[PDB]
Structure formats: structure tokens, C-alpha cells
Homo-oligomer: 287 residues x 4
């Protein structure tokens, strides 16, 4: 009955805190876009600090640079690794040429890699799928059915898309303490070969259903939450995409009916009106 | 009976109009090939307009450029970010060198990214699958079976390919108004481990079938359309591909039989003749 | 009984001849490695022929090049699009600089794309799966079972790998002429979460089997062939791979038993001996 | 009863030794990170050794290089293929210019490819999934159930993840010698639409189970091992990942119960405590 703390947030993210360079690839792609341009911008500097430090490690090898001045070796270093090569700051002798070839080799390895991640980070698209703000439990074809709906926000379609409704709630074990059980709920249409507009997902509540007989109260008490797992291959990106959302007992409108989002234009051509997406019809009795 | 407006077009595209920078990645890959070369061509210009604007923000730092002339700073700017570095327009002092390194850093970030999308846009292949112009309903192994066929237009094969026949038609709810129902039709062979030539898809019409007993009329009236969803992994691209098509009541040849597309060459070696692909045998009674 | 022409070759390729720039992406990746280096090597030349043709379209704009000589404009053109920029052949005036920026823009678009395909073509790996030279039909757990085996030639493993045995043979329709039927044969283990060594695929021949009761003769006569479709995700490439093979009636050793390929090393550690891979035990009666 | 040699190691790797340039792509991605930077660093050198050898193959074509000195042609060669182009070492005549364009063409093909692999090798991520050190067999909902658990070590989640428990043990054929049988064990939850924290996998031991009635002894004797095959699409990388592990008879704690890894923080917010991950509760009788 009483209000409780959310285990999952509306965006299907968790409120559990785990407890714990050693995971660079993940780290690299994982970091905020500024921190990345920072790391890279950094590495770049350090290598030219190293090479500048190399051409000085040997005598005054480059021409037109002042002796022992690291500055000159460093700006040369950028000009040799970025393949600009103006022609003022220039090498001298066999040794300087060898180092330059090496820095050019790296500068080329530098980009090839800076570009790999630059792209990996890039090729992680959203589905632009919209989830309904509530869900309803309402009789459908004479059976109390729990339902929620989602819509594709993009012109381009999503193919072989599918979704999961997963109840989560505390339940006493046959023996021992209480644990939240992961109940994957059976749907009338789990898969959808194509999805461009709107989809009402629904789980009929029959004798086998975890929420069979469950009321608001018993639900509240079981501390039950629901989680939508949507996934599918976006036609637009030619690639996979996903999306999560979470609902709570407060959200479920009982006897709710989603409202038809399909509208006729003045022109008379039909259309989809995402304004009704969250509208839920409800019947009100007297007093 | 009467003619009606198409909900889907032959190319399986929709005639619904939704209603609604905020979606850059999608936008970027989404845009027409000219608009892209335009955006990029543009950004390029703006940055060199910015850098040219930087070397001028400080005194006359570059050598061989006229003072205060933005022009010189800008063409220098392209030569410094594209790593040409002729050696006429050249930096001076510590500050100019630092900016040059920064522009070189960007010019390298610029390409790495311009190349990501250049490739993403590129790696979205067609299946080169051809759909039959009509479909038929014809008895097959003593059961009225709805069928349509598709063929692979490329030498290279498509693997683990599969298709969906999805009837779409207006149907009165158990209560409330009319809605088009998404009937996914059961096929005799949904999957095909490999597909290189021709495939007749078919949905037997038995007691469970949505179109069981349905006639042209009742079909027309139910405003029914059919949609082919083909997908599969092209051997050629080593990658996934798909294709849609739509059919209408007018298209279905009742009692139609697709005509064998397999032909013997003069040499005697057998072959596939895509000329008969759309040919449908029909029996004509008297008068 | 009599020998016949193969519809599929040992490498699971077809002997049907279809009948039929318009398909560039496919074409590009499709072509032989020389033809590719050729197309590219070509395009490169044509553009610099175009740009060289541009700097000449206007007066003598570049310095150190002879007037009206296309040669000079062309080698300059490579040096401006490849971002070498020695500093002999150099622009003059606002117009030359503008074209140079444009060629640099293209030269950078040129690589980004030349690299996309350079990579796409590259990232199409073989599975290095080996197929047995014959197949056998032999009693297994008291049931005549058709079987064939394949092995992974690479240290690295293949995961969620699966295979299809697909009989192909001419069969008279319930009405009309003869057509080859695609019989996908039911296996005892279609999927395999992991595969690194050897796998005997097998299709038990029971009452439901297409080849139930079929003999060599009836098989020969039905002109039956079998096709192995293997697919799976190679751990090595972190990517998908596949492989086909075809067998004929001549190949099937009846009463054949594949011979155990697992061998103990002198060291005593166990090992896999791909020498027995194609060895088939057969029992020989008298006379 | 007696101790035996492990067929699989804890990391799910094999102890079988197979028996056997011809497989470059695999080889390339396969090799240790040093050996790679080596091969490349090498190829680079050889080509410039070739080009340097070309400009010398013809007369003294480049300006500012000493005649017949390969050294000069080689360092020039790096400066022409890396597109630095200082402007000291410079071409002369039509022939030198043509070769330079060719080397620039290659130097650009060189990077495009060096970058393909540089990235392919890069985009092969770990799942950072942790496996429990033992497994248990313990009654669960009144049925002896074999179980093991794994946890996601990364903030980011893994989606549509699934696992396989695969018993492996020597078993006498209906006829002939002994072979290890690949028993894929049926689980209560094979698939999991999402996985971020902890997952107890479990195989109920009923009449159909390979290990039905099996004891430590009979297991030991059957030389049975178990192999966990985990796979799933990491949300972090936007890509697929996998992980193997192996267990032995010694590892299985009979009557074991994994210990709840979920802990409440001082703040009161809940959390996951990977310290209990390997903790197994066991009941101890008297004496
Ligand atoms: C809603 N659906 C999943 C059953 C049908 C497909 O969605 P849509 O065709 O309206 O875009
Ligand atoms: C038509 N099919 C899907 C059943 C068989 C495979 O197609 P194909 O082998 O003719 O290219
Ligand atoms: C043969 N198999 C497919 C059943 C088992 C897995 O193959 P392997 O473990 O011997 O490499
Ligand atoms: C354990 N599970 C697989 C059933 C549920 C999902 O895992 P998780 O939600 O705890 O990260
Ligand atoms: Ba350059
Ligand atoms: K220069
Ligand atoms: K110069
Ligand atoms: K230069």
C-alpha cells in the first residue's frame, strides 16, 4: 500500500551500486566525449614530447632549429608526424631521417587507431523508440490483459523488432529469505517483422500469469515493477538498436485503454498523431 | 467491391503521415548524397574560417601572408589542416606553431570522422531481391494456398534468408471501433538456409488462416493488403540485407499458377529464366 | 542407375546459368583484387587529369609549371591531392588556392572511401571448416542414419555454429511436371554452442524422412544430391563465417562408419588427427 | 574416484593438440600485438626499399640526393609515401613524377589497409563476465539442481544474453569403443533479455537429465566435465561478446548453496557485493 523506493528508473536503469586501464577498450568507448578528445589530444602531445626528446637525444640533427631547444624539436615533431613537412624545420644525417620515418610510421598508426575508436564510439545509435508513460490493465477479448505501447519516432523503420515484458518483484523462496524474481511475461506478439509506427504490447493475464489475481495492493506489496526490453534492427542505420523503460505500480491505470493514435488529415490522407500516445481512456463510476 | 486507397505502396512503404539536429546521427546517414557532400564541404570551410580567424586574432604570425588579410590566413588554414605544407605560407613564433599543431590535430580528427560516416552510409546494401508482380491463390496439394515468389538478382547467394507474409485488413473489435489487424500468416517454409535463384513462398489456407473462406469480395471489403518482409545475410557483402513489397486485392490472381522459370539452354546446360518470373498460368472456362 | 550431371559442385556452387554500374556496391566488392586496384588506380588518374585540366582552364595559375603544359598541372595535381606539397609547384592568386582546397577536400574524401571498400572487401573471412569427402548411411543406435562430418581447421573456435542437411531431388508433383524438391533434413544436433575440433552431423532415417526406404538406386533415380550449409560466428575474427559443400549418390558409402580422428601423442597428451578425417570403415562380406 | 587429467581448463580452453600465409587474414588478426607492429613496420621498409630502388633503377631522378646512393632514395621514399614532402629531396623529369604518384597511391592504399586490420584487431571485446569458482548440486524447489553463477563486471549491461551448460563425459557406445558425449543440459532460463548484475544458471536434475542419479563417484568415473558457454550483445560496445569457463568433479560442491551477493549500503541504498560471488553455503552434519 505504502510508497517505496524505485529499483529501476523510468529509463530502465538500475539503482544498485556495485562494489569494486584494467579495462581500456570499454573505458575508452565508455567515456564522455570531452574526456576522449582530451585523452587523445594528450597522447598526441606526449609522443611529440618524446620525439622532440629523441632528435635532441642525439646532436642538433634538424636544420633551422636552435640547439638544445626542446621547443623546436617539438613543433618539428608535430610537422613530421602530421605529414605537413613545410621545409624549414628539416632533418640532417642518416639518423634524423630514420627517426622521421619512424615517427611517420607512428603518426600513421596514430590516426588509423584514433579513427577506429572515433568510429566505434560513433556507430552506437539510439532506436528513437518512444514508450508510453503508463501501462494499463484492461479486459481485452474477455481476459484481463496488461499492456503498454511504444512508437517509432523516425521515418525509417525497424525490422524483426521484438520486446519483452519482465515483471520484477520480491517473492519468498520455498525455503530461506526473500528475493526478487525475474518473471518474463508471455506476450500475444513478442516479435514483429517490421515496426514503423505504433505497437501495443500486451500480456494476457491467465491462470499461468505471475500477475494472475494480483491486485494493485498485492502488487504494491510484492513491490512489483515492470521492465520493457525493446530491441531490433534499424533500417535507417542498417544496424541494431535497443531501448529500455520501467513502470511501477503507481503507473498502471487499471481499466485503462490506450487511445487510438491514428488520425485523418484535413487533406483526408491518414496519419499518426503522437499527441494521443500517452492518452488513456478510463471509465468513471458514480460518486 | 469498390476501389480503395493504398495503405502501402508496391515498395512496401507507408502512406501515413506522422506528426512532429535533435537526431544528428540518423539525420546524417539519412540525407541525400548531395546534401552530405554539402554539409561536410561546409564544415570544412567554417573551421578554416575559424583558424584563419585565429592566426589573425593574434598578430601577423604566419610568414608570407599579408597582414590582416583573412584570405591568406584561410588558404594557409586549408594547407595546414590538410597537411600539404608547401613551405611558402609558414608559421612564426611559439603561438603560431601551437595553433598549427591544434589544427593538424583537428584536421586528423576531421578525416577520421568524415570517413566513419562516409563508410556507414556506404555499408547499407540492397538485397537485389525481386518480388513477383502479383500473387496467386491456387489449390496446392489439395488446399487453397496463397502464394507469391521472389528471386535473387545477384550471382552471389543469400544465406539463412527468411520471409514473412503479413495480411493487413480492417476488422471490427470485440468492442469499439474498427482497426486494421496485423495478421502474420503461417508459411510452409518461412526459413531458407540458402537462397540464390527463386523461391515460391506460400501460405496454405486452412481453418486457422485469417483468409479462410475469404473471397475476393470479402477481401476487398476487409480492405485487405499483404506485405512481404524478406530478410537475410548476403554472401556477397558478408552482411545483412532486406526488402519489402506490397500486394493488393486487385493483384491476387485466383486460380493462378506461377510458371516454371527454369529453362534448358541450347548448350543443354540448365539455367534460370527471369522472363517467366511474373507469368501466371490461369485456366479459362467457357463463355 | 546411370551416371548424371551434377547440379551442385563439391564446393556447394551452382551450375545454373541465370539470364540477364546498375549494381555498383555489389560489383565493387565482387570484383577480382586486380580489377579493383585497377578501377581505383584509374579514378585517381582521371581526377588529377580533371584538376590539372582545371588549373589550365584558368590562366597559368601555378608557379614553376610551364604554361599550357597539362603535364605540369597533372603532377602538381597528384601533389596537391595527396597532400605532399613539396613547395616547387605552388599556387598563385585566390582562384588557384580555392581549387587546391577543393582538391584537398576530395583527396580526403577519396581516401575515406577508398578505405571503406578496402576494408569491406577485407572483412569477409572464410570459416576454414573442412567437410568430409563422402557421407555414410549406417545404423546408429538401431536406426539407419545418414551422416557426414566437418572439422575446424583453425586453433580459434567457432561459436553458436549450426548446419543444415538439405536433400535435393526431382519429384513428380501431385499434378503437373517434375520439380526438384528442397527437403531440409532433420538432424540430431542442428546447433552447437561451440565448435573447435570435429563434428559428425547426422540425420536419422525414420518414417518421416524423405530418404526413408530410399536405396542407392531409388536415390540415383530421384537424382538426389545433398548440400551442407554450415554457418557460425568465428571467435578468431569476432565475426560470422560460412561454408558449403555438396555430395552425390556416388559419394555415400552405405554401411560406412567414420573413423575416430582422435589420437594419443607419444607424450601421452591427446590430440586430433585430421589424417583420418576422410577414412570410412566398411564391412566386407564373402566373395 | 582417482584424479584425472583435465580436458578443458578453467578458461574453457582445450588440451587437444591438432596435427598440421596459407591463412593470412586469420594469421594477421591472430598474432600477438608486437608481431603485428613488426610485420607492418617491416612491409613499410621493404616498399621504400623497393621505390628507393626504383628511382635509382632510372638515372639520378631526384634532386638533392647523391647519385647511386640508395640511402637518399630510401628516405626520400618515406617522405614521398608518407606525404610529408619537405621540399629538399624532390623529383625531376616526367618519369620521377610518375613513380611518385604511384608511391603516393600505394602509401594511401597502405594506410587504408593498415587501418582496416588496426581496427579489426581492435573491435574484438571481452564480455567482462565473471564465472563462479565452483558449481553446486543442491535441492531447489524439491529437485536436485546443478547450478553455477556468473556476474557482469561492467556498469554497462549485456542484452539478449544466453548461456549453455554442456556436460562432457566418456560413454560406451551401443557398439564399439568409448567416446566423450556432448550433452547439452536443459536450463530453467537459457535466455535473458538483459543482464547487468548476477545470474544463477541452473539445470534441474530430472529423469531426462544426463546426470540423473549420477553421484560424485559415477561422475568422476564417467570423467565428466562441464562447460559454460556464455554469449550476448554488450550494450557498452554495441556489439557481441562471449566467455567460456570449465568445471570439474572436484569443483562441484554437493548440497552447496550460492550465497546472496546483494548487500545494503550504510546509506541504505542497495548494492551488489562481488565479495560473496564465490561463497557457497554448505550444511555440516555431526562428526
Ligand atoms: C504493431 N505491430 C507490431 C503489430 C504491427 C507493426 O507496427 P506498424 O506496421 O504499425 O509500424
Ligand atoms: C526455394 N527455396 C527457398 C526453398 C530453396 C532455395 O532457393 P534456391 O536453392 O533455388 O536458390
Ligand atoms: C561435435 N559437437 C558439435 C557435438 C561438439 C563440439 O565440437 P568440439 O567440442 O569437438 O570442437
Ligand atoms: C539473473 N537473470 C538473468 C535472471 C536476471 C537478469 O540479471 P540482472 O537483472 O540481475 O542483471
Ligand atoms: Ba600530408
Ligand atoms: K613542403
Ligand atoms: K620549400
Ligand atoms: K609538404
Amino acid at each position: 500500500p505504502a510508497r517505496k523506493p524505485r529499483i529501476l528508473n523510468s529509463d530502465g536503469s538500475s539503482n544498485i551500486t556495485r562494489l569494486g586501464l584494467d579495462d581500456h577498450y570499454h573505458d575508452l568507448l565508455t567515456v564522455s566525449w570531452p574526456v576522449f578528445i582530451t585523452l587523445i589530444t594528450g597522447l598526441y602531445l606526449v609522443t611529440n614530447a618524446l620525439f622532440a626528446l629523441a632528435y635532441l637525444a642525439c646532436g642538433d640533427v634538424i636544420e633551422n632549429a636552435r640547439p638544445g631547444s626542446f621547443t623546436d624539436a617539438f613543433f618539428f615533431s608535430v610537422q613530421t608526424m602530421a605529414t605537413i613537412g613545410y621545409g624549414k624545420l628539416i632533418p640532417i644525417g642518416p639518423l634524423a631521417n630514420t627517426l622521421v620515418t619512424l615517427e611517420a610510421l607512428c603518426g600513421m598508426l596514430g590516426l588509423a587507431v584514433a579513427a577506429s575508436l572515433i568510429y566505434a564510439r560513433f556507430t552506437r545509435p539510439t532506436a528513437g523508440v518512444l514508450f508510453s508513460s503508463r501501462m494499463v490493465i484492461s479486459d481485452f477479448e474477455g481476459k484481463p490483459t496488461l499492456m503498454m505501447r511504444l512508437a517509432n519516432l523516425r521515418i525509417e523503420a525497424i525490422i524483426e523488432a521484438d520486446v519483452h515484458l519482465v515483471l520484477v518483484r520480491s517473492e519468498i523462496s520455498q525455503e530461506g529469505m526473500v528475493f526478487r524474481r525475474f518473471h518474463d511475461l508471455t506476450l500475444t506478439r513478442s516479435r514483429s517483422p517490421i515496426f514503423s509506427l505504433s505497437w501495443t504490447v500486451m500480456h494476457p493475464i491467465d491462470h499461468h500469469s505471475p500477475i494472475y489475481g494480483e491486485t494493485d495492493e498485492t502488487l504494491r506489496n510484492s513491490h512489483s515493477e515492470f521492465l520493457v526490453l525493446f530491441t531490433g534492427h534499424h533500417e535507417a542505420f542498417a544496424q541494431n538498436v535497443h531501448a529500455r523503460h520501467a513502470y511501477s505500480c503507481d503507473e498502471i491505470i487499471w481499466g485503462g485503454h490506450f487511445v487510438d493514435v491514428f488520425t485523418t488529415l484535413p487533406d483526408g490522407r491518414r496519419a499518426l498523431d503522437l499527441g494521443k500516445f500517452h492518452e488513456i481512456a478510463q471509465h468513471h463510476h458514480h460518486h
